[model samples]
Target: HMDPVSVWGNTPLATVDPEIHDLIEKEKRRQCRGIELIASENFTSFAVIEALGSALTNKYSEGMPGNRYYGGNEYIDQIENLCRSRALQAFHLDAQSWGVNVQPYSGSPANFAAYTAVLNPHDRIMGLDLPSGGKKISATSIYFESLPYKVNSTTGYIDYDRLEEKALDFRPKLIICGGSAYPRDWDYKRFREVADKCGALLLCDMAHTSGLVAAQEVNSPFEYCDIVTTTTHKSLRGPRAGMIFYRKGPKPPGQPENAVYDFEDKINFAVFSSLQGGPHNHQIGALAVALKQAASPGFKAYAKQVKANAVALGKYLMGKGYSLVTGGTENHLVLWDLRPLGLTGNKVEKLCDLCNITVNKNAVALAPGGVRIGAPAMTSRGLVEKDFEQIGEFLHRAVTLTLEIQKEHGKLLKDFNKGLVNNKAIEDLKADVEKFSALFDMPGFLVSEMKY
Candidate 1:
């Protein structure tokens, strides 16, 4: 069953009618058939689909599990328990344990909830500076709503050395690490040290690596973090929503409270009563189901493959002469400096899409031009190291062809980016993409499914 009708425009998977389901199905089919390489995107399991399509949408849990404005939430306690338990089991932590709020609707609100949860109105903050195709949100832009301590230049990792100077000077109450384009390990120990130096709180937004890290395929920031937040999707392969878990912290200054109760009260207060109204119950259902699937045996193997593909793809691009932002990748993403190819990331992203290969335009470290390619979608299709090598060749061809088109019409679009859209060169590049992707199994593995 689906959620009831809403006066609002639309929710992630909510529906007043059946059209949204069909649209999602078609979108899924297109993904299955396309050469999906974007690292910040992934294919969810059938289990996640069950939660998204379940009947949990009927209730409203506005406050935390126990403290809610609404009534009849006996199961709300059980639902939150399911989510919190899965998170603990997956990440290996204990009241000093990971306290999770399974309510935040999506990554933006989740980040907002996490930020507001820790800071008083007077505190300052920092976040990832995102461009197109990157996970950017207005919460970072408007400070009155939520202030973000930003850097003049943020294409690369947080300038810890410079940040050290700023943190002491600005004396911020908190410092947030991790980003949407971060293609490497979370510097947990270093970040914790930084916060300690400033006497500030440390929060890691592991939204991008939540899945792989939790499954033990990649390094986890949890071991050295006070609080960690993530969307259940992306690399985690969960439903499209958010979650916040406070890992290993000082106890809830209360005597009668259990470990889980702290999350429902502290995090719940900051997330629901303080910042938001009702936590979408359907999103909680979906997250719980997705977390369960991540704990399955197959998930570890799948997470490992994503990282393998990421490394292979980055190396393949480097071999073809593309400059990487961090020099290389440690996660399932490759941040490419597009200057070597003499193409704008925006242009390259469109060209890749034209060739049916989807990638994002990302900001790279002082890298003149920007581009980002990831391995989530490709790895989901079971593409291994060898497949990434082949995929890299296709991307190189696409990048090369794209630059040629820009060069030929560079003067024409000098006033505005007007001529590249219909450039004959791009049409020819699609042929190379078809030729390249054809070298392996179809990137569109979702199409191979039967409707029945």
Candidate 2:
């Protein structure tokens, strides 16, 4: 018979629940075997992962750092304070001018918390349309009126002229810049100008490029936007969490004379009392670890390599005659348009999955005509530009195989999937991908230590 102590706290996960343990092991193996190109994914360092799996998860810090509602949050306050400071430091912000909340669960809630802090119910908000990599913030439409802007259909670039024209008439209270899938950099200056002309506050959801921003590889949105939100995971190499940065000090030049940076209390109160309760202490601890890593010189080098890998992959894919949205990437992701080759993104994504390469189907404007590929995760595994070129070759092969399979079978998804099952060529590609993937080291875990 098992003792109470063993049953309650001493038992290892593998011994306590083999079924769940086996699934986690399988997922780890899958990650080890595949080329992860999904634009939103990244591999965190062992330090970050260790923090996530720590006893910090057992704490309940219900409010901001110094003003916690719980009694035993003395150390939790220090951890949360450290996380906020690191978050600001990673983005090169001064505490006197900017205040950050590291409590939001993830990107969506971070955005919502900012909105809730600033806008009343049924307020007007504008963002880029979904097909162009914008988030579906329309969920806010239940309480707020939402409008969407679009990128130029032909160039796959944000149509600033059209956006301005719409904003002039729609008169949204808030305008959002940055997106999930747009490959090119944002013109935050133009966005600022438009927001000013339309009497709107600016928010930049720099979720995808926060790592690059920290490295100074891209333009800083902080100089232009009034608020900034980012996911800690993508490109940041952090835990699955979110942080919000709001202007707190005197308004900069060009803002209205009477303008006030009053978002600190409103946003913190919204996050704690309105949107969520006790913050996830484990996520905050891990984010603190990641932010420390991100501020290091090595992280800057890694961020540079991430972009370099993307550029190489994009160049290779373009050389293969594939069409890229916005022509190319200014960051770490490439939106590859497959419609030029008469291939559907869904079919190609499925083909890549069979080949043990991971990518997600994305929209070109309004249709599923492309796949979004990223370099951050692979770069985290210590891959370089040449390795990315090899990945490009593998993707090209997968595309070619998809076309061939589509020709042999019908173009319909059901028929195409039928042809994919147990296909020898696909199996060979899977083996090759696994072999190549094994050449690189995964950052957080040792495959040799993993049990089947």
* Residues 276-380, model 2: lDDT tens digits: 557788999999999999999999999999999999999999998999998889999999999888878888998999888999988884348889999999999
- Model 1: CA > 4 A from native: 1-26, 66-71, 128-137, 144-158, 247-264, 274-277, 365-368, 411-452
Candidate 2 similarity to native, TM-score: 0.94
Kindly report which residue pairs in candidate 1 clash with one another.
32-444, 32-446, 33-444, 39-374, 94-97, 125-149
lDDT of 1 by residue, 41-90 (tens): 87776656666766676665655654432357767667777877887777
Q: Model 1's lDDT to the true fold? A: 0.70
lDDT over C-alpha atoms for residue 298 of model 2: 99
- Write down the lDDT of every candidate, Cα atoms only: 0.70, 0.89
Candidate 2: residue 231 lDDT (0-100): 88
